[PDB]
Design a protein around this ligand. Sequence first.
Ligand SMILES: NC(=O)C1=CN([C@@H]2O[C@H](COP(=O)(O)OP(=O)(O)OC[C@H]3O[C@@H](n4cnc5c(N)ncnc54)[C@H](OP(=O)(O)O)[C@@H]3O)[C@@H](O)[C@H]2O)C=CC1
Ligand SMILES: [Mg+2]
Ligand SMILES: [Zn+2]
Ligand SMILES: [Zn+2]
Ligand SMILES: [Zn+2]
Lengths: 365, 365
Amino acid sequence: KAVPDKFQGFAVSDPKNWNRPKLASYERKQINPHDVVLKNEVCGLCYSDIHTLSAGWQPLQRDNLVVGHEIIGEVIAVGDEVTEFKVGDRVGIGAASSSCRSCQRCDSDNEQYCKQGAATYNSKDVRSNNYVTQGGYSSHSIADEKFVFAIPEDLPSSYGAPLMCAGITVFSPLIRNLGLDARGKNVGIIGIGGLGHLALQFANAMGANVTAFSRSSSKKEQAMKLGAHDFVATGEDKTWYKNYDDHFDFILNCASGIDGLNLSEYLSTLKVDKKFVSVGLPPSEDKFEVSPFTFLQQGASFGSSLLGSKTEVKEMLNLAAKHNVRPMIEEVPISEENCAKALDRCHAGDVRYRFVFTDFDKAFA
Amino acid sequence: KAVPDKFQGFAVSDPKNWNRPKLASYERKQINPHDVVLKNEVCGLCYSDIHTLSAGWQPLQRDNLVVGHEIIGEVIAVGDEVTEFKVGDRVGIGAASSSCRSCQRCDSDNEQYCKQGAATYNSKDVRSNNYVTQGGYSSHSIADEKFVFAIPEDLPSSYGAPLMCAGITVFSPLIRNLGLDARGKNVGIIGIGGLGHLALQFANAMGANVTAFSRSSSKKEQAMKLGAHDFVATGEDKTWYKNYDDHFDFILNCASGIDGLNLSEYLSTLKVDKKFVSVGLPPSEDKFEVSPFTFLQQGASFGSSLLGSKTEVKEMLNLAAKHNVRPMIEEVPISEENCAKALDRCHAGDVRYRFVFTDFDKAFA
Ligand SMILES: NC(=O)C1=CN([C@@H]2O[C@H](COP(=O)(O)OP(=O)(O)OC[C@H]3O[C@@H](n4cnc5c(N)ncnc54)[C@H](OP(=O)(O)O)[C@@H]3O)[C@@H](O)[C@H]2O)C=CC1
Ligand SMILES: [Mg+2]
Ligand SMILES: [Zn+2]
Ligand SMILES: [Zn+2]
Ligand SMILES: [Zn+2]
């Protein structure tokens, strides 16, 4: 009665039908002693959802897979061991949903890097009898309390939602590599989508000197408004990197692909011993290419970063409220039709800058 | 009259004869205000000498090329603006010999990364009328003051010479990534050869917990003698990484072939947000693919390091003195025959662990 045995969600079984999710009922994950159960209110559309649904990284790990991992909802139940939340709290869930609670990472604000971590969707939870996790395009969500985040009362759910993944995912590497105060440091942000448009704002808020990089200049005016001090359209200014020798303290890639992205040219603009970090994750088949030479010129490193920690989520929300960092969203009532539309438009790149699904009651009640 | 108009060296003009250098005379570089002129005493045999002589990655940039860049010698002359060295001083030269003196990198302990820098051999020196630089298999050497290092009296020349390249090449990434006091830190050193044998000793001297890696156990007893605290034979213990979860603060690849490395195994043993760095690899311009997924689970990074700074060299030498860090060398009177024998063996891996050419007074007029 409090929690139904089955949840409802918009689901896909075949990657050929990645853009045609359909209403499905499915057995819920067990509620473990540290678990929190939400009645979902909103969910953002992350390009990770599309990569997952299209099997561009790996095959779908279950039938009727429900994606979505920028979730805001209300607590309707908690396990007996939950200490951090109570029924009626409005909270958020991002891209990871549980960890082992018994490793050093779990106890030192690296729980998103737990070796036995379970993603919010498409992932086997070994703590829940190998339940393959179900996401947030759904009436309800379950996550371990370490992966459920308090939402400030003044942040409306729709704007709060993309911060649960896009936000924390770009905030984590910026604070880790630049410090909270990034004054004097130059930061490049590649790929001005969901993640990138938030990275511009967060980097600007930290005091950094921000260069926005995009394949074209169509997003220039908005990027400038979002906190970029500098804009480069790499498809138009083909030799841009020649003016940026020894310039960047850090480069953060937020692009969904490898299409217009010459990694060597980016590395050539880093200062000595600085990092290029890709939070962007193209399909598994697609890679960047780059010679030992250009690594050698700079002592530059290439790497990636995954999500962020709960400590970091709290810091990020504080900073966001402080400097008015908010995602630019387009709200869409959840439905088979609207999810199809929104997935297709997101794939087409037609969005400024994040779709957020809303009005869950009309769908699931 | 102080400096001879011509120097003598064992030189090659055809990469087909990479391993059979012949005595030859050549006009010296002009002596610039910050230049230092050495009468050479010893020169270590570095593997990059074989890379260069064989032209495997870059063609010979002059006729009668003289390689060798692990030089110890005695100052016979200085340009009018030198202040740090006086005639009679016993000094050393590594793999870079000059830099622009007018960029941030030169200004800030990164002169080895100067964009207009000149290698100790086979490099056009834009400051010296495009003279193609000549190395230390020779009677004399000329280098810029910032690339000439004072040798402490307690360091014999033959033992000091490999510190000028191998030593700094491995010490720089250690100090840059572990800090100079690396107590409590775990470091992995891959490839126990010319470079790795010094890397073990430096890492141990800095206070680190050192794991030595090689394909077989053949170098294990030696690695243990050189400062390794434990050893992994990756061809014998194929699942070794299972016992090193979340272990390493840094991993340094000491010229082990990246193709022959299973990078993913090493990366899976790093702590969060750490680096796998490679040194001593040929500066090939051939591309190779990189994927963010390779690094994602650890927030890891991959990159390179090139030589090191004079500041770092000074620290390295003090450390070597305090802790008795010293290469294991096989001394070889310089001659055509001995150069051939040593080049052949060094190419083979058949040296324990560095050849040092000696007795220059008998070879040279
Ligand atoms: N590391 C992590 O933990 C997380 C990673 N991600 C990943 O981050 C990436 C971005 O996600 P999100 O911001 O939602 O995606 P969006 O589609 O919202 O934005 C992606 C941006 O990439 C650029 N782009 C689009 N197609 C290509 C292509 N073929 N090649 C290169 N660039 C392209 C566009 O920027 P422009 O028009 O400026 O060129 C676009 O705005 C995805 O790969 C996603 O899987 C997401 C969440 C977390
Ligand atoms: Mg003077
Ligand atoms: Zn993801
Ligand atoms: Zn854990
Ligand atoms: Zn310079």
